[PDB]
Structure formats: structure tokens, C-alpha cells
């Protein structure tokens, strides 16, 4: 028959005979992280000697 043959699938040091291998558009979901932040804090300010 007009068939290219058999598909050997290697993936990360593996060897697989697949059931059904393909590529198609699919509905996925995307996540979002909030970006940026700021802060203030108490400080001790003093003097001992000036030259």
C-alpha cells in the first residue's frame, strides 16, 4: 500500500511505537503573575564628628 512505513519516536533517550501521533490546534489556558512592588522603613540618623 502507499504507506511511508512505521514511526519510531525518540524523546529524551526513549524509543516508542506510538498509537496515534499528530499535531493540531487545541484550547489551552494561560496564567498571569502580578508585576512589581515597593517599600519604606525606619532609619536611625545621627552624627558624631565632622571634618
Amino acid at each position: 500500500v502507499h504507506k511511508p512505513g512505521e514511526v519510531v519516536v525518540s524523546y529524551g533517550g526513549m524509543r516508542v511505537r506510538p498509537k496515534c501521533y499528530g499535531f493540531s490546534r487545541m484550547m489551552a489556558t494561560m496564567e498571569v503573575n502580578p508585576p512589581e512592588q515597593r517599600i519604606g522603613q525606619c532609619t536611625g540618623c545621627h552624627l558624631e564628628c565632622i571634618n
Binding site: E6, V7, V9, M26, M27, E31, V32
Partner: protein, 235 residues
């Protein structure tokens, strides 16, 4: 061209074809899309002569190009069901369509899902001239032939015999699947990772394979290997 058979045209709409067990004979039946009609008769409870002069050579896909379509020896998931090599199901109400293809005059199509595969049909006369969920009644169904107007397929997917493997190998690849895609957590209600809230609809495509578990193994970084060998089925 044709595989073994250029199946004839039958004018009487009521064409009762029972189950057949011959391996070589049933191929022309698939070339006559007899299994495609049988899905309609089993599930849409409509008996219609499909692929009149259509055959496999005139089935159209959403992508304009398929080298594997030229290779008629490749089995398709829809045709794997006549042999029962996989399963297909009714269009669930929880399923939403991908807006890729143009659904004009369409009746039956396919969907490769992350769990399995699903068929979509509706009423005879009620034609999908629009990309909407419903299908309006149309007189284009008066003739018995729609030359792959009622038939359209998604993706250039290959299918072949499979030797089983322990699930721990499937598990580490499943663990490997998450490593290569930190940007997704949910696939169609099936959980893929665990993160914050996510926007439900996204047209998204990655190569994938089936090995016989509920999850699909996807890849963007694999490599292929083609070999020819003697197998009694491939005769």
C-alpha cells in the same frame, strides 16, 4: 491514487451494509467512506450515501497541505474505528469549537482531544453553512452527494500499531511534558499544571502522540525515525 478500489455509486439511499470481517475487502469500504456513513447512522440516526465519487482522494482538511494525505496507506483515527483501533464519541455539550476552519455546508468533522477523539454531526437538511454551534436547514442536502462538503478533518495525524509500555515510562514523559512548557496549567478542564487563574480560550498547537493512556504526550523538541519492515497487516 486509489488504494485497491474505486468504489461504485449507489443511487438508492437506503443502502444496508452489514459488518464484514475481510481485511482487504473493508479497505474499499473505507474508500467508499462506509464507516463515515455508519457513524451517521449509528449516532445521527441518518442514513446517507457518503463520498459519491468522493473517496479518500477528495477529503479536505483545515490545513491546505498534507504530504501524508498523498500517502493513502496512512490510517486515520476515524477509519481506525472500523477496525476498532480507537474510540470516538458524541459531541458533548461541554465542548467549544476551535475557530480555525470555515464551517460552510458542513455536517461531520473530527477533533483530536487530549483524552480521546469526538465526532460532530447534526440533522440532515440542517446544514452548517456557518461556524456556529447550530446548523440551519438547507436544501443542499436534497442530493445524496456532498463532495466532502459534509466531511472535513483536523490535523495531519499518523496512526500505527503500538506495543504497550509500563505507565512509569509514561509518567516520566508526563513529568517531562511539564518541564518543556511552564507556560500552561490547564487543558480543556483536564489539569496539566497547578497555578493561578487562567483564561479559558486559547488557540494553541503542539505536536503530540498517543500511547494508550488518558493523557497525550506532547512535544516541540522530539525527532522522528521512519523504517520499513515486513508486517502481515501491511499486505
Amino acid at each position: 491514487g486509489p488504494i485497491i478500489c474505486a468504489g461504485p455509486i449507489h443511487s438508492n439511499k437506503s443502502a444496508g451494509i452489514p459488518h464484514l470481517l475481510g481485511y482487504s475487502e473493508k479497505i474499499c469500504q473505507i474508500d467508499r467512506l462506509i464507516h463515515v456513513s455508519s457513524w451517521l447512522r449509528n449516532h445521527s440516526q441518518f442514513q446517507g450515501y457518503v463520498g459519491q465519487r468522493g473517496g479518500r482522494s477528495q477529503v479536505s482538511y483545515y490545513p491546505a497541505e498534507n504530504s501524508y494525505s498523498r500517502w493513502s496507506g496512512l490510517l486515520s483515527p476515524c477509519d481506525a474505528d472500523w477496525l476498532g483501533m480507537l474510540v470516538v464519541k458524541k459531541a458533548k455539550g461541554s465542548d467549544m469549537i476551535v475557530p480555525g476552519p470555515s464551517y460552510k455546508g458542513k455536517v461531520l468533522f473530527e477533533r483530536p482531544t487530549f483524552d480521546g477523539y469526538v465526532g460532530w454531526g447534526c440533522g440532515s437538511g440542517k446544514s452548517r453553512t456557518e461556524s456556529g454551534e447550530l446548523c440551519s436547514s438547507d436544501s443542499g442536502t436534497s442530493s445524496g452527494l456532498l463532495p466532502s462538503d459534509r466531511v472535513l478533518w483536523i490535523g495531519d495525524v499518523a496512526c500505527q500499531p503500538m506495543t504497550p509500555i509500563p505507565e512509569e515510562t509514561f509518567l516520566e514523559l508526563k513529568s517531562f511534558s511539564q518541564s518543556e512548557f511552564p507556560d500552561i496549567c490547564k487543558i480543556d478542564g483536564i489539569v496539566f499544571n497547578q497555578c493561578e487563574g487562567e483564561s479559558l480560550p486559547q488557540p494553541f498547537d503542539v505536536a503530540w502522540m498517543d500511547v494508550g493512556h488518558s493523557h497525550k504526550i506532547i512535544m516541540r523538541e522530539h525527532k522522528t525515525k521512519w523504517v520499513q519492515e515486513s508486517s502481515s497487516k501491511d499486505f
